[PDB]
Amino acid sequence: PISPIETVPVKLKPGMDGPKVKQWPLTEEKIKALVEICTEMEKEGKISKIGPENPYNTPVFAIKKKDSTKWRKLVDFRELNKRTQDFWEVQLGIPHPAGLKKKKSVTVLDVGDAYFSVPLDEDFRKYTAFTIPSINNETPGIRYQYNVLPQGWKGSPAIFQSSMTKILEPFKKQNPDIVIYQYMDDLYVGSDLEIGQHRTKIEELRQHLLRWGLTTPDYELHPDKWTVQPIVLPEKDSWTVNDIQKLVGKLNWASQIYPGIKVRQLSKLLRGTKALTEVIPLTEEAELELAENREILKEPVHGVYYDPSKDLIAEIQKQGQGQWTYQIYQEPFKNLKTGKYARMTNDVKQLTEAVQKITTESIVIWGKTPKFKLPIQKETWETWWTEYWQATWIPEWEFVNTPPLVKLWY
Amino acid sequence: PISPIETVPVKLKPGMDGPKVKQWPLTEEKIKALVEICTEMEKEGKISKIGPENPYSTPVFAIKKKDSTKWRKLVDFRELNKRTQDFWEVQLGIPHPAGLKKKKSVTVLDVGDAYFSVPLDEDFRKYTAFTIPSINNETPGIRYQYNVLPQGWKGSPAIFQSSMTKILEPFKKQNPDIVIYQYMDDLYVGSDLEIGQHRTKIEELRQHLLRWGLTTPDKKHQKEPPCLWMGYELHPDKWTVQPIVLPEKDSWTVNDIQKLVGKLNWASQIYPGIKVRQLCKLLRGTKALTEVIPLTEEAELELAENREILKEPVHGVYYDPSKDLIAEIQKQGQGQWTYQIYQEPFKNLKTGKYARMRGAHTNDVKQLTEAVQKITTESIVIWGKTPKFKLPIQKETWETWWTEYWQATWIPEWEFVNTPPLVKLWYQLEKEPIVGAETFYVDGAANRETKLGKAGYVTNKGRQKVVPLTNTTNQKTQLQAIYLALQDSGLEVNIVTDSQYALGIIQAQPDKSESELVNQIIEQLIKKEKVYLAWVPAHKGIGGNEQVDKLVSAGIR
Numbered sequence: 005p006i007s008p009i010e011t012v013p014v015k016l017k018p019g020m021d022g023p024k025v026k027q028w029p030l031t032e033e034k035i036k037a038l039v040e041i042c043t044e045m046e047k048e049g050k051i052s053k054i055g056p057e058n059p060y061n062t063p064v065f066a067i068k069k070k071d072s073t074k075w076r077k078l079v080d081f082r083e084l085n086k087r088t089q090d091f092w093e094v095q096l097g098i099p100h101p102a103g104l105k106k107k108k109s110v111t112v113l114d115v116g117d118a119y120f121s122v123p124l125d126e127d128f129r130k131y132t133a134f135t136i137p138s139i140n141n142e143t144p145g146i147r148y149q150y151n152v153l154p155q156g157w158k159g160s161p162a163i164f165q166s167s168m169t170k171i172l173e174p175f176k177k178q179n180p181d182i183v184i185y186q187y188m189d190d191l192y193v194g195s196d197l198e199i200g201q202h203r204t205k206i207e208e209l210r211q212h213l214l215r216w217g218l219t220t221p222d223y224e225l226h227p228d229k230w231t232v233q234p235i236v237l238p239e240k241d242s243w244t245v246n247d248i249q250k251l252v253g254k255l256n257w258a259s260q261i262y263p264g265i266k267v268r269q270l271s272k273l274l275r276g277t278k279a280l281t282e283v284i285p286l287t288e289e290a291e292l293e294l295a296e297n298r299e300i301l302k303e304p305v306h307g308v309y310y311d312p313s314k315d316l317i318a319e320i321q322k323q324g325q326g327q328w329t330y331q332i333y334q335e336p337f338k339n340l341k342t343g344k345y346a347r348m349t350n351d352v353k354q355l356t357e358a359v360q361k362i363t364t365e366s367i368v369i370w371g372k373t374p375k376f377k378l379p380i381q382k383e384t385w386e387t388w389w390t391e392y393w394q395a396t397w398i399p400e401w402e403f404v405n406t407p408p409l410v411k412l413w414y
Numbered sequence: 415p416i417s418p419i420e421t422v423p424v425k426l427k428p429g430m431d432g433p434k435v436k437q438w439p440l441t442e443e444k445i446k447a448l449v450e451i452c453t454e455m456e457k458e459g460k461i462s463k464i465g466p467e468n469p470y471s472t473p474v475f476a477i478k479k480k481d482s483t484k485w486r487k488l489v490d491f492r493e494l495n496k497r498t499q500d501f502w503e504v505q506l507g508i509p510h511p512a513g514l515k516k517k518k519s520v521t522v523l524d525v526g527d528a529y530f531s532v533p534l535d536e537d538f539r540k541y542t543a544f545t546i547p548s549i550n551n552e553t554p555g556i557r558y559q560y561n562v563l564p565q566g567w568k569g570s571p572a573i574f575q576s577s578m579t580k581i582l583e584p585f586k587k588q589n590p591d592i593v594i595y596q597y598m599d600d601l602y603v604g605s606d607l608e609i610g611q612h613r614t615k616i617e618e619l620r621q622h623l624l625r626w627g628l629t630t631p632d633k634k635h636q637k638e639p640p641c642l643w644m645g646y647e648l649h650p651d652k653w654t655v656q657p658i659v660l661p662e663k664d665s666w667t668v669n670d671i672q673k674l675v676g677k678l679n680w681a682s683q684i685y686p687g688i689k690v691r692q693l694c695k696l697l698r699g700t701k702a703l704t705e706v707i708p709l710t711e712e713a714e715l716e717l718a719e720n721r722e723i724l725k726e727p728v729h730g731v732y733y734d735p736s737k738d739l740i741a742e743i744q745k746q747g748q749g750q751w752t753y754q755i756y757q758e759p760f761k762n763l764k765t766g767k768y769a770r771m772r773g774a775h776t777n778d779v780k781q782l783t784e785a786v787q788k789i790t791t792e793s794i795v796i797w798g799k800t801p802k803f804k805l806p807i808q809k810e811t812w813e814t815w816w817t818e819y820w821q822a823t824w825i826p827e828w829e830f831v832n833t834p835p836l837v838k839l840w841y842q843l844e845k846e847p848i849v850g851a852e853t854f855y856v857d858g859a860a861n862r863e864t865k866l867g868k869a870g871y872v873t874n875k876g877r878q879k880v881v882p883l884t885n886t887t888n889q890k891t892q893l894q895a896i897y898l899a900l901q902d903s904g905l906e907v908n909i910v911t912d913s914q915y916a917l918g919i920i921q922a923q924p925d926k927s928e929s930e931l932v933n934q935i936i937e938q939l940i941k942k943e944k945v946y947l948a949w950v951p952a953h954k955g956i957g958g959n960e961q962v963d964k965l966v967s968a969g970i971r
């Protein structure tokens with residue numbers, strides 16, 4: 005009753021090499037937290053010091069658990085994932101229940117600490133290499149690899165699936181209408197129970213886990229409260245030439261996306277070559293057009309479906325005064341979902357919160373995270389994003405230094 | 415000697431065999447040298463004679479290299495290197511002296527024959543096999559293999575470094591307040607002990623180093639009072655760049671001008687004010703390396719302004735981790751910027767300059783921010799924390815812009831400092847249409863085949879105009895229409911465009927550009943009292959926008 009278990013053979017993608025990502029410069033306090041965390045991890049047999057014959061790297065970050073309560077170590081396996089993950093989610097994928105988004109309440113439980121139980125395939129360990137940097141490059145820097153399944157990594161939940169099925173089976177049998185979805189270090193638990201009682205069911209579920217390696221796990225999402233109804237058409241919007249012109253542009257564009265946008269009664273009213281600030285010699289058949297048009301904007305884009313074989317991508321615009329608009333689409337403007345996030349300070353604080361919130365929606369909705377287009381300077385995001393990150397995954401990100409009049413439409 | 419250190423397992427690249435390169439024939443001289451040298455080597459354990467049982471060979475040769483009229487032995491490891499696994503790192507960052515904490519004493523220790531002092535793997539030695547050749551390849555060569563790290567082998571820098579780090583750990587653990595920096599062959603050792611006891615401690619280190627195979631052939635702790643390293647001169651208590659004689663000529667080749675700029679660029683990390691744009695201007699359209707470029711008047715000013723700053727030496731101080739860092743930035747020149755970082759007022763740890771590029775069109779508030787951002791990264795690397803900034807920008811100037819601007823931003827805590835010139839907004843676009851201002855439906859059109867363009871406008875006041883244009887894209891005829899509106903408009907004006915593109919540029923309130931049509935527009939924009947810019951979509955037959963198209967695309971397309 006005390007030794008290790010037996011390991012699943014793991015292959016990197018067909019003739020692909022491991023990650024050789026540059027570690028990003030980090031703050032002193034974070035370095036400190038990082039060697040302190042890793043000292044334990046090493047003593048607990050989880051990581052070992054590696055030598056120079058391992059050319060691989062994967063960046064590492066430390067984040068605060070809530071705020072100043074503890075430091076967590078976060079590993080960025082985005083690259084390792086890409087080089088493992090055309091071929092997984094296939095040979096050993098985990099299906100996504102459509103029912104999850106339809107549940108009144110979904111609770112996110114971090115079951116990451118479980119993975120630290122199962123040993124990682126000897127010949128795969130070298131790829132999990134990471135480096136604790138030193139300040140000013142004064143010291144070569146502490147290097148490690150993993151011995152057990154690492155938390156950043158998409159292979160972990162894939163391997164662990166079997167244990168999760170057994171662990172979870174009694175519970176599911178006893179509540180066949182609870183929807184439990186595993187995505188990386190978290191379980192998503194969904195149910196149509198009332199809120200307390202939902203929570204009691206979460207607690208009960210927590211005990212099933214606790215018997216197996218999860219050190220008292222973990223939220224609350226109410227998916228059927230996630231709303232579309234965006235692209236707004238003003239109300240005292242039927243006054244000026246400038247109002248109408250703007251309105252027409254808003255519709256002109258919407259008719260790219262949305263089958264049915266009328267706009268013609270509206271192109272009239274303008275008729276002449278007027279000063280921008282003139283109030284209007286029409287407002288009749290057009291107001292009906294406006295009505296109709298508005299009502300098609302409440303509802304889903306008719307033409308557009310989620311294609312599981314395509315990257316979800318997400319745009320975000322800064323609306324100012326703490327508001328942010330966002331779109332999830334697979335091809336530009338065929339929007340799967342559109343939304344808002346508001347804090348009514350910072351800018352990057354709010355953005356990282358936006359991204360996080362969006363990722364979670366995307367996960368509960370489609371079982372993928374989006375590729376984010378971020379309206380910020382790369383350098384600035386790199387410097388600052390870990391300061392507010394709280395999640396255990398990291399989605400891919402581009403930076404989009406442009407925004408059209410796209411900000412306005414939204 | 416050879417270190418008792420545990421060897422680093424090394425393997426060839428997947429599915430690849432060791433090198434089997436045929437040894438070319440050498441001159442007698444060179445053979446004799448090779449035999450002599452190898453003997454010494456064989457004697458010291460470095461090398462080992464081997465059978466023809468071993469396949470594999472990597473060519474050897476010999477010459478007078480580093481004026482080596484005692485003869486140096488070379489091994490062409492190209493083939494083995496292509497066949498050896500990548501290793502970690504190689505090395506990939508160096509310290510900046512401004513991060514060093516002040517010491518009473520530092521000394522250099524050069525490791526003896528570092529590479530040759532570290533054992534090679536053993537399961538790998540076989541591949542390092544080489545062959546001293548017979549006089550006229552008539553008879554079998556002498557075959558050796560390496561037992562230590564060879565000179566040009568892919569992994570020798572990484573393994574040596576690795577080996578040295580391990581070796582150093584117990585001594586670092588027993589002496590937690592001594593600072594050791596490993597750089598190639600050298601160790602720099604820094605302490606706050608009194609001259610005598612510091613010398614004791616080096617000797618201990620030397621002793622620890624000898625226990626591990628590594629001679630420091632420097633007895634009595636060699637060095638010399640000012641350390642010269644990676645272009646710096648380092649002292650226990652201050653630091654600087656090392657030379658920087660700027661020659662005195664009437665004629666500068668392109669080459670001379672490059673060297674000169676590199677040098678000034680180097681100096682500028684400790685000499686505040688260094689400036690090189692006029693010197694860089696001379697470099698445009700590289701006109702051959704060997705060719706003389708008459709210094710412009712603007713350049714001669716700079717070169718002298720520079721000699722001025724390098725008149726007397728300046729030294730950076732070192733870092734007290736108990737105090738805050740402060741970063742001061744100053745606008746200086748056009749897209750140019752300069753900065754000082756310091757802790758006690760004006761004892762610069764270091765200095766720098768920034769002269770950006772982050773787009774075709776930009777403005778001062780943007781560029782000051784990108785500079786702030788570059789310094790922020792630089793600070794985290796060097797000192798592991800962020801500096802408190804002092805900035806030539808009003809708090810309200812910055813808040814106005816950034817709360818308005820669509821991209822997001824954040825900078826560390828900062829204060830306004832009145833170091834003229836200040837950053838301001840030369841113009842504010844209006845947020846709403848202007849009552850009683852002439853509305854100018856501007857429009858463009860180009861043929862894209864002939865390149866023939868018409869840019870004009872129509873107004874609500876009935877005013878119209880279309881002027882013809884020639885080598886233009888659809889895009890310039892947008893920017894020309896808008897500019898045409900700004901010339902013929904009063905101080906206040908509304909402008910309707912249908913150019914996503916043109917609206918994009920102007921909305922970002924630029925104050926500078928790599929387009930000439932644009933610097934013009936910005937001139938107009940500054941002079942105006944109120945400009946409102948609105949966007950309608952192309953050829954949707956809109957009131958006002960329709961009519962400009964009837965007479966823009968007539969001669970357009």
Ligand SMILES: Cc1ccnc(SC(F)(F)c2nc3ccccc3o2)n1
Nearest residue numbers: 514517593594595602603604648650
């Ligand atoms: C010269 C000086 C001044 C203050 N502290 C130090 S510490 C050091 F010697 F380890 C050290 N020597 C170095 C040489 C180059 C780069 C970093 C160094 O650190 N050194």
Ligand SMILES: [Ca+2]
Nearest residue numbers: 857858912913
């Ligand atoms: Ca146009």
